[PDB]
């Protein structure tokens, strides 16, 4: 899930009050890879938000269609959020 961008080494003496103690440190800088999240967490949310705009192109009198579309988009967003909370 990560990619090691860089690794570093440092040697130093920690000046603790009683006396100085040696120390080495090996650091890694990880950078997270996002193709998972872009393809799976952002794409469906963007698509559902786009689908929610379809109601504006439907007539006002078509109450059942617009209501079903809007509330089912809300339900789909709820499902995505809850299950993504569970998985992540």
């Amino acid at each position: 899930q990560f990619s090691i961008v860089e690794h570093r080494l440092v040697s130093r003496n920690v000046v603790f009050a009683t006396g100085a103690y040696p120390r080495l440190s090996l650091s890694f800088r990880l950078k997270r890879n996002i193709g998972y999240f872009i393809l799976q967490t952002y794409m469906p949310s963007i698509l559902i938000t786009i689908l929610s705009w379809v109601s504006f192109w439907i007539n006002y009198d078509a109450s059942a269609a617009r209501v079903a579309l809007g509330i089912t988009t809300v339900l789909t967003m709820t499902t995505i959020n809850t299950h993504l909370r569970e998985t992540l």
Binding site: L51, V54, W57, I58, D61
Partner: peptide, 22 residues
């Protein structure tokens, strides 16, 4: 989205009556 585009061009709000010749 295809259905949305189809519905955008629908004129009459009533389907075929089943007893007419168009």
């Amino acid at each position: 989205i295809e259905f949305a585009t189809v519905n955008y061009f629908t004129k009459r709000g009533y389907a075929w009556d089943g007893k007419s010749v168009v």
